[PDB]
Amino acid sequence: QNRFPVLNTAENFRYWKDRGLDRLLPRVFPLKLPAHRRVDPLLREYIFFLHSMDPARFSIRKLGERYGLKERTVELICREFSVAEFLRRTELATPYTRRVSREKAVLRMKEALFSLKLGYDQLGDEDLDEQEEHEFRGFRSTQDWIQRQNIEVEMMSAFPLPAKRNPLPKRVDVDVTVHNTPKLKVMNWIDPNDKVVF
Amino acid sequence: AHNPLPRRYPLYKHRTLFLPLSLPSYSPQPAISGVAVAPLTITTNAAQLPRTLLLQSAVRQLRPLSSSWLASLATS
Amino acid sequence: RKLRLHQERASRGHIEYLRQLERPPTPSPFPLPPSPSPSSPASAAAAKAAAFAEQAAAQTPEPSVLVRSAEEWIKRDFFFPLSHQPDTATAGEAARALERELGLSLLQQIELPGFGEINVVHGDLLSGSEGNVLAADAMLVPVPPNFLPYRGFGLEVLERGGPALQKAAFVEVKRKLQQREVARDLLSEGGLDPGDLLLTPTFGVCPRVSLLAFLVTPYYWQGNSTEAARRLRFTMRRALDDLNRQGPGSLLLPFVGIGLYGYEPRGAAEILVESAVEQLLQVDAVDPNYTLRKITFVDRDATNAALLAEAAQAAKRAWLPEHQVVPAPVYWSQKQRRLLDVTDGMLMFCRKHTRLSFKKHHGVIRRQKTHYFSNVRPFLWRSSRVLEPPPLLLYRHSGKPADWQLPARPFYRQGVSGLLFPPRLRRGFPSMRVNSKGQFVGVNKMPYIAEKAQP
Amino acid sequence: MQRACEMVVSLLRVDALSQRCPFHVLNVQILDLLQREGLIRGFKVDGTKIDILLKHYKGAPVIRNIRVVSKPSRDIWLTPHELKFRTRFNTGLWIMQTSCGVISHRDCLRMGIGGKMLMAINNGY
Amino acid sequence: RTLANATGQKYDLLVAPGEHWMHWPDRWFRPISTEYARMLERIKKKRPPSYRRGFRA
Amino acid sequence: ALRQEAGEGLLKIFRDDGMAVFVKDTALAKREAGRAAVQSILLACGVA
Amino acid sequence: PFTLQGDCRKQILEAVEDRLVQEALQLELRAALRLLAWSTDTIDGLRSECAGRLNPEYAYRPQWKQSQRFHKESYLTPLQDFFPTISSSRDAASHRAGPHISPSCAYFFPTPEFTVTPRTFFPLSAHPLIRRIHPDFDEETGNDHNPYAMHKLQMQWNHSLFIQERMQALRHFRNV
Amino acid sequence: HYKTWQRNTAGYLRTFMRNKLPNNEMIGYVINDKHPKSIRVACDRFMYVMRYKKTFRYTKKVWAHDEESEARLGDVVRIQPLGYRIGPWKNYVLVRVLHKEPR
Amino acid sequence: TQYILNQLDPGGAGRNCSGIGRPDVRLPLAKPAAPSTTHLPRHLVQIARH
RNA sequence: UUUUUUUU
RNA sequence: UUUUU
RNA sequence: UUUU
RNA sequence: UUUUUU
RNA sequence: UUUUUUUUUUU
Structure with a gap:
């Protein structure tokens, strides 16, 4: 009835989804795992070393570009590596006997099993910067919270139609730091709604 | 006065934070320094996209400071 | 400059936050009503009049709420449309006046004693016809091939020079191309490689320029963003390296990456700046050969120029000891350092029996009202939800607060930060009103506890 | 105002082609807005009564539900910020009576003026 | 949507997709077939190509 | 924009609809040639 | 058309038709403006037919004018309104000395020619x-x-x- | 008494505007003009109901004062309040007369 | 043609495109064809040919 | 590869 | 309460 | 108190 | 106290 | 449930 060969149509939205009797059918799905753990442990040591050696030449952003790592992911590698080494050199406790919540214990098992089947990743595979793309991220993505409407209705006419009312930013209160001392911390309360600045 | 947490089988899984962000303005905006800053899709995650980071960066740079009728139209 | 008083620094943050929220207006054009309207005469007359009201609605900012009586407001809402520029949209004259005195109303200079002379980022015209109109080696960023389809800074340069300059360009590339083929054949990718340089004497392009280099640049659409950045760094480093043992030290690289190959003022900017510093110091060199001691950047675009300046600031940080910032919470800890001796017997209570740990008490609230009036209301003294502000950054050596720091952290409910019909708040003149005479007078009343919580 | 509420009974018919309606000044203006949206094929003033045609598609009519909000005995008014809450996530048609003539609910929010909800077309709960 | 749009003859699109049911590109006018035997005859009769609005063509 | 063509002393400025607004066949002659071009584009572009 | 061979033939007809109409309309306007400004006998004809519609009694046959030889070329001459005249009156309005247009006609239509x-x-x-x-x-x-x-x-x-x-x-x- | 959320609804705001006039002025018709330099003005007010969302009307008869005694029975006039008490019944002052009944 | 390709693959300034349809790209065409030399300048090519 | 699966 | 089997 |  | 086990 | 932080949408 209509021609639209693209991948952002109503029917093409959320491809490979159960629409019918297949919703109740059990299906296995891949297990997610953070990128900072899938990398080769060997490379983590190397990356940490560089960071700790010369932060100027080896910045947080430049270091992650060569190995293809995000600015946030590379930060955790140094932080997690530091603590592991600190307890070994100082002869405090072994990493295996370290106390940690159950959420991390299950994560460690997955990391070991991930490599035992496929293997560790020699180089990360992720983009440093994001990209505006059409994807389904939760139920709050395909909804307009400003006008609170799902279906947009407009008049059909060839002539220029009047534009819609643009929204205004929401003014909220914030706090800033002016003077900081060991025995006292002074702060300032900002009120954007005040006409007189002074 | 509440502490949400899972109470079911799926107690340990990736729970990414989502920050819905609708269109900032419906008017047609021009390209800043030749780089287009128009909205492509309405789905936006919490992480700021590089395209949007350019518009907000330049916003802070702008300082707050700064007879007949037909015959007349052609004459001017 | 160098605001030492606490009051001056406190007011600086207020202006920065207000500037971000301020957005210039954008009046949209309105179409003319159609004369051959098929509607009935009664509706046609009303529609024609309504069109004019909308035009003035978006071009007539409203005054303060306190100006007119309450009654007046109610009648206007039901008689005229709502203006698009409310009193609580843009800042008043007070904010503009303050910036004049504070000093917020030649851009950057990175100077290193011993290695590099100066690094000026002055932005102006190159071929308009000293800081930025005297050098001896001009740069160019043409397309991979030797023919510019459209756009590009080099398109103008080549045409300006006329056939005299063009002839020299085609001869130099021909010889270089042939040399590569023979060298790669006798000893044992038939095109050019990104990172090559070519020399071309000036032919009247600019009296104040001696040489004119030709450095090829790659594209941006190839690969992802992570791969694109890696490619640009390789070309920059190779270009700079070759230039060193070429001639006198005077670089006039206007702006690399701009044109038609894809550019990013945010990301691309940092690459360039960061690269310049290394060249000067010659880090990647076993045998130091100081030849190049002058690097400058020239940009025509005002917008771009401003952005470039920002990059400079970041570059200066973490490199020079005089501009090394440090958070206050960790700065004081680092000063009062001590050596603590811990024996084996002091860690007896540190160890625990259970291996794993988790929450042993669900956070499920039992009484919503009883708990709220016992542990929520007493601990809440503000009508707005404000999170903990970021820490203050201080210097390492001098131990004084710096000027540039992190911005504010505004909070929004449910992520949405857009209001279509903002109301007229009464917070514009706290404890102040208008008298019959027109003068400003105060009031004596208890403030509403939920004033800011009822937008 | 009473004659305005008498149009829903005549226009809400399945097995019919054209229905009469009392002539009124306000009623004429209402039909103009509906025709723009494509709900009424056409109408003609036959003197003391107005003949209005009915639109059908695959048997069923285009109009399936009519709700009268305003009544002669009272008056419903909503502020510009309150109409959005009422009307949200729907395809319905609300007739708004503003000072500058009569317009639909979509245009009322654009101008930001306080209208008056008269009737509802193709509205659910 | 398909019901209301047919009778409403007005924009009845969703939020995520863009003009999926209303957009009807002319697939029988622009992509019309052309043979090499009759192409030479239309070159001298049609407007000469003098424009610049397409790079990826 | 700028479009190159075989060098024959030609200088024509076309519009969006495909209509020419300026067709070309001591220093006074050079100045007059450029004066006619600046005003020609503004005549059909300016809105009073 | 349904076949490829038949479909191609339709393109030829559409191409020639689009060009013929453009030329016919362009020349039609040229003769319309000149005739109204030169031919004086057109006033009598318009009134004779207008008055005769109500009743034949009011219809009268005018004498028109005596036939005279003409070049049948001056009525199809291009006309333009361009300001540059450094070439000794290159355009000088419609023709070299033909009727001119009012200054007010330089706002909507920059040229008197019929364009697309x-x-x-x-x-x-x-x-x-x-x-x-x-x-x-x-x-x-x-x-x-x-x-x-x-x-x-x-x-x-x-x-x-x-x-x-x-x-x-x-x-x-x-x-x- | 009205709640905080009841002062922003269109129903209450519209009723308020009708009742509200410059200088707290009122509109009413005279019903008694027997005593010298005295006229009883009957004013009509309005009120809003937040339960059924309906507005009713209730008459408010008040006494006024006239200098020239121009007003007569059955004539709509305008009244203005005053910050004192004059006479046993007199509580208002006349400004003008809108309509005049024949004799 | 340009508009059709834009919808099928979003690509412009500051975005990573697939390079499909651009003049400077090799495609697996059914039959041999010459490159798209229309976008190249005419002044620089003529002077360079000699 | 750690008193790991394994549990006051 | 007690505590490296 | 597996921080009084 | 046993069984299993990158 | 963050070694050197009093910062952290930790999960």
Whole structure:
């Protein structure tokens, strides 16, 4: 009835989804795992070393570009590596006997099993910067919270139609730091709604 | 006065934070320094996209400071 | 400059936050009503009049709420449309006046004693016809091939020079191309490689320029963003390296990456700046050969120029000891350092029996009202939800607060930060009103506890 | 105002082609807005009564539900910020009576003026 | 949507997709077939190509 | 924009609809040639 | 057409038809303006037929005018309104010494010749999401139409504006 | 008494505007003009109901004062309040007369 | 043609495109064809040919 | 590869 | 309460 | 108190 | 106290 | 449930 060969149509939205009797059918799905753990442990040591050696030449952003790592992911590698080494050199406790919540214990098992089947990743595979793309991220993505409407209705006419009312930013209160001392911390309360600045 | 947490089988899984962000303005905006800053899709995650980071960066740079009728139209 | 008083620094943050929220207006054009309207005469007359009201609605900012009586407001809402520029949209004259005195109303200079002379980022015209109109080696960023389809800074340069300059360009590339083929054949990718340089004497392009280099640049659409950045760094480093043992030290690289190959003022900017510093110091060199001691950047675009300046600031940080910032919470800890001796017997209570740990008490609230009036209301003294502000950054050596720091952290409910019909708040003149005479007078009343919580 | 509420009974018919309606000044203006949206094929003033045609598609009519909000005995008014809450996530048609003539609910929010909800077309709960 | 749009003859699109049911590109006018035997005859009769609005063509 | 063509002393400025607004066949002659071009584009572009 | 061979033939007919109509309309306007400004016998004919519609008794046959030889070329000469005249009156309005147009006609139509406008073939929209689907949508401005170009188009097709202009001319003719 | 959320609804705001006049002025018709330089003005007010969302009307008869005694029975006039008490019944002052009944 | 390709693959300034349809790209065409030399300048090519 | 699966 | 089997 |  | 086990 | 932080949408 209509021609639209693209991948952002109503029917093409959320491809490979159960629409019918297949919703109740059990299906296995891949297990997610953070990128900072899938990398080769060997490379983590190397990356940490560089960071700790010369932060100027080896910045947080430049270091992650060569190995293809995000600015946030590379930060955790140094932080997690530091603590592991600190307890070994100082002869405090072994990493295996370290106390940690159950959420991390299950994560460690997955990391070991991930490599035992496929293997560790020699180089990360992720983009440093994001990209505006059409994807389904939760139920709050395909909804307009400003006008609170799902279906947009407009008049059909060839002539220029009047534009819609643009929204205004929401003014909220914030706090800033002016003077900081060991025995006292002074702060300032900002009120954007005040006409007189002074 | 509440502490949400899972109470079911799926107690340990990736729970990414989502920050819905609708269109900032419906008017047609021009390209800043030749780089287009128009909205492509309405789905936006919490992480700021590089395209949007350019518009907000330049916003802070702008300082707050700064007879007949037909015959007349052609004459001017 | 160098605001030492606490009051001056406190007011600086207020202006920065207000500037971000301020957005210039954008009046949209309105179409003319159609004369051959098929509607009935009664509706046609009303529609024609309504069109004019909308035009003035978006071009007539409203005054303060306190100006007119309450009654007046109610009648206007039901008689005229709502203006698009409310009193609580843009800042008043007070904010503009303050910036004049504070000093917020030649851009950057990175100077290193011993290695590099100066690094000026002055932005102006190159071929308009000293800081930025005297050098001896001009740069160019043409397309991979030797023919510019459209756009590009080099398109103008080549045409300006006329056939005299063009002839020299085609001869130099021909010889270089042939040399590569023979060298790669006798000893044992038939095109050019990104990172090559070519020399071309000036032919009247600019009296104040001696040489004119030709450095090829790659594209941006190839690969992802992570791969694109890696490619640009390789070309920059190779270009700079070759230039060193070429001639006198005077670089006039206007702006690399701009044109038609894809550019990013945010990301691309940092690459360039960061690269310049290394060249000067010659880090990647076993045998130091100081030849190049002058690097400058020239940009025509005002917008771009401003952005470039920002990059400079970041570059200066973490490199020079005089501009090394440090958070206050960790700065004081680092000063009062001590050596603590811990024996084996002091860690007896540190160890625990259970291996794993988790929450042993669900956070499920039992009484919503009883708990709220016992542990929520007493601990809440503000009508707005404000999170903990970021820490203050201080210097390492001098131990004084710096000027540039992190911005504010505004909070929004449910992520949405857009209001279509903002109301007229009464917070514009706290404890102040208008008298019959027109003068400003105060009031004596208890403030509403939920004033800011009822937008 | 009473004659305005008498149009829903005549226009809400399945097995019919054209229905009469009392002539009124306000009623004429209402039909103009509906025709723009494509709900009424056409109408003609036959003197003391107005003949209005009915639109059908695959048997069923285009109009399936009519709700009268305003009544002669009272008056419903909503502020510009309150109409959005009422009307949200729907395809319905609300007739708004503003000072500058009569317009639909979509245009009322654009101008930001306080209208008056008269009737509802193709509205659910 | 398909019901209301047919009778409403007005924009009845969703939020995520863009003009999926209303957009009807002319697939029988622009992509019309052309043979090499009759192409030479239309070159001298049609407007000469003098424009610049397409790079990826 | 700028479009190159075989060098024959030609200088024509076309519009969006495909209509020419300026067709070309001591220093006074050079100045007059450029004066006619600046005003020609503004005549059909300016809105009073 | 249904076959490839039959479909190709339709293109030839559409190409020649589009060109013939453009030439016919262009020449039709040229002869219409010159005839009304030179031929004086057209006034009698218009009144004779107008008065005869009500009743044949009011219809009269005018004498027209004696036949005379003509070049049958002056009525199809191009006409333009261009200011550059450094080439010894290159254009000088319609023809070298033909009738001129009023200065007020330089606002809507910059040239008296009948041209073709590039009318769009898809509906416009205001939402940013819908504008991206329009074929004629440039990324350098974010809009699917040129406000300056569309501003003049609406003024041309306006009965209210034309009535005021027509009324002003009528008063001048009647008074003086 | 009205709640905080009841002072922003269109129903209450519209009723308020009708009742509200410059200088707290009122509109009413005279019903008694027997005593010298005295006229009883009957004013009509309005009120809003937040339960059924309906507005009713209730008459408010008040006494006024006239200098020239121009007003007569059955004539709509305008009244203005005053910050004192004059006479046993007199509580208002006349400004003008809108309509006049024949004799 | 340009508009059709834009919808099928979003690509412009500051975005990573697939390079499909651009003049400077190799495609698996059914039959041999010459490159798209229309976008190249005419002044620089003529002077360079000699 | 750690008193790992394994549990006051 | 007690505590490296 | 597996921080009084 | 046993069984299993990158 | 963050070694050197009093910062952290930790999960």
